[PDB]
Structure formats: C-alpha cells, structure tokens
Amino acid sequence: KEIRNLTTSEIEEQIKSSKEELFNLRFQLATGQLEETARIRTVRKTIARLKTVARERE
Amino acid sequence: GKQCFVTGRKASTGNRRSHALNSTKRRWNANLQKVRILVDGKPKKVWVSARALKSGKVT
Amino acid sequence: RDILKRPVITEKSSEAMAEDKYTFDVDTRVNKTQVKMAVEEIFNVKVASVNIMNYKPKKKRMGRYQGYTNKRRKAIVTLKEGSDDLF
C-alpha cells in the first residue's frame, strides 16, 4: 500500500502489528474491555499488506 | 498371461460345437515352449512358440 | 508465539484457582512445552507447570438449523514468579 520502506522496517512492522496490537486487542475483546472493536479488522489487514509487498520483493 | 517372445503369438477364443451345433466357448492356446535364448545382457529363458523355433534362432 | 488465543474467565474453575493458576484457550496442535515457553516469552514469568485437556465439539448451538461448535483445547499454567495473565 505504497509502504515503500526498508525491508528490515517491513519485518519490524510485521512483528509489531502481528502480536502486539492485535494480540492485545484479542485479549481486551475477550475480557470485556475493548470498544472500538473495528480496530481489529484494521490491524489484520495491515498485517496482510506488509506481508504481500515483502513477497513481491521476494 | 503368456505370449511368444519373438513373434506375438497368443491364445485366441472361439466356439466348440457338438454334432447338433450346440455352441460352447473355448480357447486355442499357442504352442509355447520354455527355451533359453541368447540375448546380450544375459542369456535368458523365455516362452517361444514352436513355429518360430524352426528355421532361425539362438539357443 | 501466539499459540495462546484467549484467557478463560469462568466462575469457580478459573477464579477459585487464580491465586496461582491461569487458564487459556490455546491452539489445538500445541504441546505443554510450547505453551510453557510461550507464556514465559510473552508475560516474562517463570511457569512452574502446565496441564492441558481437549474438549469435544458440542452440538448445543442449534437454531433453526442444527450444528456443532468448535473443538477447543484449554491449558492451565501454574506460575513460580509473577502474575496478571488474564484481567
């Protein structure tokens, strides 16, 4: 999605979005503390884009 | 089943008739013989019909 | 890794033992070794032990059309130092 960043920044980004944001929101939506639930489907799709462009670079 | 090595001979199928023309299915086998013929790689023993063994072979 | 899915906050068999034991729904193809190392890598604790049990898919959820739920795997971890593994 026009991320156009250094591939190591792509790996830092997949590793940040991959657990931290998404895993935290998955715990919050279970223990009854997350509203703005639509964050989740945002982060998921972000973790797809960072992966696809890295695969395009190969 | 079996069949001649050199040529392709193999049993065929037909009828067997009585004196009243009562048909019944039967076979016609080939005259295969176990003969040790001489091909390079090794001399091997294979089925060959007695029709091919006449006039030309290695044994 | 994220081999842990959910905390399991139930009435007695998760809150009557939350003095030291913390229960999760985990992935269905993992060990207690994988979960014992995943908890220690996520929360930074020392996990004394871990017990796991499988649950079959119940056919309870039936609306106009009858169907089954998901098979699920539940893991209880006993800590040796630390806390706060489900809020």
Add this chain to the structure above:
Amino acid sequence: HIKKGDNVKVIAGKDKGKEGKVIATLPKKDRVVVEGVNIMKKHILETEAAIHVSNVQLLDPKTNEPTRVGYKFVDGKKVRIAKKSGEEI
C-alpha cells in the same frame, strides 16, 4: 439514477404534485426517501417512507418543470443536462 440532495417532483402516487429534497437512497431496490412524501405512522410516531425512483422527476433549473436528464462530456468527465433546456443540473 437520482442522487440525494436533489430537488425533485413526485410524478405518481398519492403525493403527486408535491416536491422535496432526496434524503436517503436505496439503490439495490430503486427506492428513494423524499422529504414530506409518504408520511407513515408506526406504533405512534410519524416518518417518511421510500418511494420507487420511477415516480419522481427532476426539476428544470430554468423553468421549474419536470424533465429527463442526459449526459454530455464538457471535458474529460460527465455532466448532467436537462432535456428541455441544456443547462447542467
């Protein structure tokens, strides 16, 4: 179609002859909500209800008359123009 924020006139129904602004649009079934048209009373509060888009006709910006709309290309894009006059609407 008829995009909202447009001043139309009701050509058929029991509201025919009135005119209002398009508020909502349901283009999967060709329904539009006009203002002040098809007032319904539900159990008791009173609202507007949808009307088939075949029934409302756009008003000429020149003579305030119901017309049809066509399309032209003034540039590298489309423009809507009335059928009676020729002005963008």
Add this chain to the structure above:
RNA sequence: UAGGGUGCCCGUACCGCAAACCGACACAGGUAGUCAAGAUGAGAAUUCUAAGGUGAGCGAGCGAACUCUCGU
C-alpha cells in the same frame, strides 16, 4: 566374544443388568469382568436383616356374572 534441572501425544465428565447400550418405545428379553457383611448352615442354598439404595409416571370406590393367580 567380533569390535541443580528436563520429561511428549490420545482417553478421562456421565449411564453401564440400564429411563442413557442391542431390542422402532422411559419396552418383564439380552449384555464380558472385579468386590462379596450378620443370625442359620455343607453352602455364593433357604428365611430375616447390614453397608447402600428403593417405593416402579394413573388413581378413588364397590366387593355382581365371567376370565386369570392363590388357600381350604
């Protein structure tokens, strides 16, 4: 004879001589194995009981003929 720690996967609830298994049924049938109290006795027989369970998913009257089971 020639030569101080680590410890995985599946089952585990419940009924199991039964209203939850095989008999279309909350059906007198069938269903492998372990345990095995007291009085009496050859005894895992017979009668009465212990540990433990149970009162059986239609009743209330009347006390005719007749059918079924039982006593003289």
Add this chain to the structure above:
RNA sequence: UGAGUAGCGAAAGACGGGUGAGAAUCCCGUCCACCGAUUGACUAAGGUUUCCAGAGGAAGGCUCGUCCGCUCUGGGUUAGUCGGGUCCUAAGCUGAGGCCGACAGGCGUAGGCGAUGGAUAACAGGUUGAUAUUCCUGUACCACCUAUAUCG
C-alpha cells in the same frame, strides 16, 4: 365409524409443613414397606454431553406436574508412574524382487502391521455443584542432561 369403547406395561404407601394461578403426583420431614451372591459398589464394550447450577412449562412423559434423561441460558473432563503410542509379537492381513494368469488380478519370499498374551517407575489423606493414583499437602520411584579402565 367402531366409542368416550380396549388399554394406561409385574410391586405399599400414610400423614404433616411448604412453594404456587393451580398439588394423590414437585421439595423437606416422621412412621411404614421392598432388595440385600443384589434393585448395593467399581469398571470393558456401546452410547456421545444424557453430567452441574440458575431459569421454563407450548410439545415429549401412556394421568398430573410448580417436576425431569425435555426447552433456554452459563459452566464442567487437568497425568513423567493409571489404559493405549514413542517396546515385543499370536492368528490374520499386506508384501520390494518373484511365480501364475484373456484383462481385471490370484498366490508368495525378505520386510511390515497386529492383542485378547509378555515387558514397563506412586502411595496415603483433603478438596468442589460438576474432575481425582490426574489438583493440593506429605512421603517416594524411574530415564535422560549439565557441573564438582569402560562400551561391547
């Protein structure tokens, strides 16, 4: 229609107090009665959520039902030592090469799979509405790893 007719599936219940719109039929209680080499306790098949708590009374229950193995909503199955795998092999099945066979394929060697049998380290007590040599307390045992001649 037969017709409010046949049946309602072996058997001991009685009263008191509740709850409730409604009680022979549900809950608690005292008296009585039945089994007790079994109707008691534990487990293999086999079922596969039927187990527990809070609510329900349309249908199921051969009557009733305020109740349930039924409907709704939330829960419940914890292992280094227990039964199976990471050990062994009966009977049997499968079988590289191989033999036989119109085709399909049949048989069979090395090898392999395979228990109902062989081998193999854990016991007492406590706890919940629902687990229990599994969780907890106490006391143990076995295999491997790292530290401070043997293998055959």
Add this chain to the structure above:
RNA sequence: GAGCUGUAAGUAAGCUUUGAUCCAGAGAUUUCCGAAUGGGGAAACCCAGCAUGAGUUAUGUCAUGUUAUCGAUAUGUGAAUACAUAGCAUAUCAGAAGGCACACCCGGAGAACUGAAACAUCUUAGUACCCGGAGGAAGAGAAAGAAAAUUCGAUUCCCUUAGUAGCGGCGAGCGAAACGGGAAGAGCCCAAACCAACAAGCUUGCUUGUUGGGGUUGUAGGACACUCUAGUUACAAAGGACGACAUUAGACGAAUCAUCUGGAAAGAUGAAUCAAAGAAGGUAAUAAUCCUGUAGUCGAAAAUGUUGUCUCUCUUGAGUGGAUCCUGAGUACGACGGAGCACGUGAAAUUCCGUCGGAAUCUGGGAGGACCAUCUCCUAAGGCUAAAUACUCUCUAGUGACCGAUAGUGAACCAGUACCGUGAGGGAAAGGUGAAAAGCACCCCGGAAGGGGAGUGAAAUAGAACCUGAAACCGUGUGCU
C-alpha cells in the same frame, strides 16, 4: 461515480470524492486429508531419519527443505565362474501413476429372460454388464478395387436401389452391395538394388553390424550408362521472429401533458410527439414517450485465440538406353478346428485366428462368388493423413399452439437432505400477507396462551396456523313433522 461492511432482521464499531462497496484481466496467499508418495493407518491422525537454523548453562521442544515404487540414464558397477556379467549403491528427469461426461469412439471377453404361440439349431444379440486405450472426435484411407462402357480412379457420410438378390427346423426371422445424385477434398514417406565413410576382424571387400547419399513403381518403375538445367509446421522435416480482428468489464441512446373513478393511473375522455427504437421486464391497475431498456453507433491497461504479410527455414526437376541387379518369406497358400463376411459348411469365392506342412521372382504374383483355359483390371506380405461424420459434463445469446407446485427434474424449499439399512443402496414432504412492515402504541379479563377494543391499512374472516377457501366431517339456533 456515491454510498458500504453477503443472507439476516438488530445493535456496536467503523470505512468512503485523497474515489469505499462493485464489475473485469493479471499477480500473491492457499491449513489437514486424498494417486498421497518418509514409515504406519480404523481418510482428515500417529511416529520418524538427514541438513540447516531459533531457544536453553545442557538435554527436553520448535521452524524450513528433503527422504515412497516403477522406468530410463551417467557414473562406483570389479559375484557362485578367474575375469567379466547377476546383484548392491549414488546422481538426474514437468517420465508414469490418479480423476472425470461408463455421452460419443476402437479393442478384449461376453449372457439371459424373450420369440418360434413347446424348444435342442436359429433369434433376443455380439445387445446388457465388465476390463484396457485414447481423442476432441475416433475408426477407415491413397486399389494385389469396382466392373464388363464410346470405362471409372483413396477413404468417410447421406438419399435411393430395396425389404430387392440372397441366408434359413428354407420355420420364426435375418438382409446386402455395385451403379447413380450429392457434402467434403492432403497426398505422400520408408525397405530393397547401388555410391561414399565407420570400427572389429581371419585376405580388403567388414548391410560380416553402424552412418550419410540414393530410391518408391504397373504408364511396370527403379538402380545402372547419357545430356541438361518451388516455401506449404494438419501428411509431406520441424524451432523461432512479424498488425488487423474475436472473447473476457463498459458509455451514449428519440419522444406526454391535462380531466373522471380510485388507496394508487399505465384505464376511460381530450389534445400532442418519436420511430433503423411498437422486443421485454418493473412501476401502488392495463405505459412506444416514468424507470431498466431496445434500433444505431462508440470502447479495452492486461491475458488468450485466431489470423494476413515480412523474415526464419527448406530444396536441382525432367527425357532417353537398355546387359545385368532390386522390388517387403516361415510370408502367400494348403489340410484340420473356429470366427467373420446379409451369406447357418453349403457347390462358398473375398478375410482373420491356433496347430502342422510350405511357393514364384516380371515369361513373375493376385482378382473377376467352387474349378480350368482365354481376355480385362491390379501390383499383398511396411506406415502416416485434414474435411465432410457422432455426442454434450460446460460457457454465451435465444426459442416453444412445453409444465405451472399431486404438474415440471427425485429436488421452484438451504434435497439426494429428514431419514432407513451392517452395507452396497433407497428417498420424500414443504410455494403465495400487503403496493409499502406501515408487522397492532395504548386500555381491559387472564399466571401465560388467547381474546375484546382502539389504532396502521383500500381491506385485519389480510395479524405471520397470513391470496381464494370447496367437499367429506363437527357444531349452534330455529319453520313443518
């Protein structure tokens, strides 16, 4: 080009003119099984070797790649038998495997009930089922043919001959072909005689085995001696480069207003317009002019298919002469036993199979329905090939004096499903409120169910047990008996 997060209603949270959702071409990802292929196996699970990497003082545990069988092929390939050659081992390979439309096609094997008013031949019938092999079609195919003329010139299909000539317990029945009129129109490459090279070998005579040239015939034609100078990748020998069309999204697209009834106008009454458009569907009723459309014209980043030219290839064609040499062998054919030809062993030609015997070489060899002689036509024992032809799992348009929910698919519905069987397998039944949910706020009896109002509606005996609502059957009231 303005809304959207499928059904599926509702909430909650959000995205979108800085172009969401949506449509199309291409790309990425694609868990476990399954031929399933590392080993095992009660499909969707268990247990591993090796290499490498992540973690731990260290084991334990992870992530990724690879490891089946057969075939061929290079190498190590050297036994019992010296050596070699079976084994054994390593490396390489879009090599095979399985599936599906058991619709069509070819081959192998192959019934029976039925008919004959019995049935044994014969028919049903080389049909059903089964197995192998493909292909988009297949099979056939370039005269050892048909025939009897002033001849024809591969094969395939159709019409007709013709229910003819024939076959036959000569019963029941089976049943041609040639001609002639047409669809379609591809013909060619090898083997052999001889020429030049290649090893090994006992003279060099080694197609002694290998390779390239040569050459394909009945007009007998070729070698042999002699002169003399078009491509066609669908056969012919197979690899690449070269702009127009077609498919896969789309855009524009003429012309109507008023009155009456009505809940609502498209109907009736008046006037009026368009038409290369009066097909059709929707719209509160029956619309050429309200919407979606139709006639007509325009459009394509990218993928594919087909196609034209230019390259890229390929490539000496005929006429004479005749000494002599070549022209497909355990083949043709015969006897015995079968089958196939419309043709049942018959006087049975033509053609295949198993077993035995076994020819000739252009004066040659075969056919013209036993067989012989004379005449005429042809040149087997090697192979490839497009069109006309058959069928439909599937996609794109469209049609019907086809059905209209007991019909039409078994299935208009979440059906091959409830279910039912150990299993193979069998198999239903279920449509409709209204134009728009406006789907009954509120009051009263009742524990709730259910009503009675009052409201929505054009209609509530339209209230989700929803169009209409009939007969059997079940009731309540009453006139005469």
